[PDB]
């Protein structure tokens, strides 16, 4: 599918789709796992795999892409959904440098 | 100045400018007062005066425009600044209908 962009719209439609039809919720996090997810989406939906970044730790890793509603919570981490993320751009609040 | 749009960028630059050089902070709210502010900005900076809407009450009136960081708190209200507004689109969280 046409190489498209990761807009806030996309980030939710997709963020949503992963909850209502999938076991990402809870699933322990690993770089390799993220990559197959990232590579998959990129092929399935078409978004270039470089948007799924989280804040640097320690603690909770808030997504850098507003709209994407999944943070990584406890360094063993899990894919924890959270919809106040679809409205609160936490990661920008904490790390304004990144934006 | 060229009739421009009220983008999140503008909404803060402007939202900021009002704190660091003005007594809007606290000032009791009235429709008429808002209007002279709205009409002024529109002339000064150039933004068509129809962006400064807040949520319907009771209670706190969160701005409908993300970026604009001023809510109306207590029905006598005041122009109360708040920067977690530049990151949290509260009004969309509460009233998803409006968006």
- Residue B80, phi then psi, degrees to nearest 5: -100, 115
Place of tokens 């001023």: B70
Q: Please classify residue A24 by burial: count the beta carbons closer than 10 Å to its beta carbon, then call 0-12 exposed, 13-18 middle and 19+ buried.
A: middle
β-pairing verdict for B70-73 and B77-81: antiparallel
Residue A91 in contact with residue A83, Cβ under 8 Å? no
List, edge to edge, every strand of the sheet that includes B77-81. B28-29, B77-81, B70-73
A32: alpha, beta or left? (left if phi > 0; alpha if psi -120 to 50): alpha
CA distance B56 to chain A (A): 19
- String of b and e for B52-86 (b: at least 16 CB within 10 Å)? bebbeeeebbbbbbbbbbbbbbeeebebbeeeebb
Matching residue, tokens 């008429």: B32
Secondary structure (H, E, C), chain A: CCCECCCHHHHHHHHHHCCCCCCCCCCEECHHHHHHHHHHHHHHCCECCCCCCECCCCCCECECCCCCCEEEECCCEEEEECHHHCCECHHHHHCHHHC
Put simply, the answer to whether A88 touches B92 (Cβ < 8 Å) is no
* B89: closest chain A residue by CA: A87
By what technique were these coordinates determined?
X-ray
The CATH code of the domain at A1-99 is 3.30.62.10
User: How many C-beta atoms lie closer than 10 Å to residue A77's C-beta?
Assistant: 18
Structure tokens at B12: 């803060």
Q: What's chain A's length in residues?
A: 99
C-alpha radius of gyration, chain B, whole number: 13
Nearest CA-CA partner of B64 in B93, B92, B94? B92
At B15 the three-state DSSP class reads: helix
Cβ atoms within 10 Å of A6's Cβ, excluding its own? 20
Helix (H) or strand (E) holding B73, with range, is strand B70-73
Residue A82 — φ and ψ, nearest 5°? 180, 110
3-class state of residue B78 by DSSP: strand
Q: List Cβ neighbours of A20 (8 Å cut-off, separation of 6 or more).
A: none
| Chains A & B: contacts with CB separation below 8 Å | 17
Domain residue limits, chain A:
1-99
Taking Cα atoms as reference points, which of A74, A80, A67 lies closest to residue A5? A67
H/E run at residue B28: strand B28-29
């Amino acid at each position: 599918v046409p190489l498209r962009p990761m807009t806030y719209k996309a980030a939710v439609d997709l963020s949503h789709f992963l909850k209502e039809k999938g076991g990402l919720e809870g699933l322990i996090h690993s770089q390799r796992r993220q990559d197959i997810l990232d590579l998959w989406i990129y092929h399935t939906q078409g978004y270039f795999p470089d948007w799924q970044n989280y804040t640097p730790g320690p603690g909770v890793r808030y997504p850098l892409t507003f709209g994407w509603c999944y943070k990584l919570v406890p360094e063993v981490l899990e894919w924890r959904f959270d919809s106040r993320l679809a409205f609160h751009h936490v990661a920008r609040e904490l790390h304004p440098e990144y934006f």
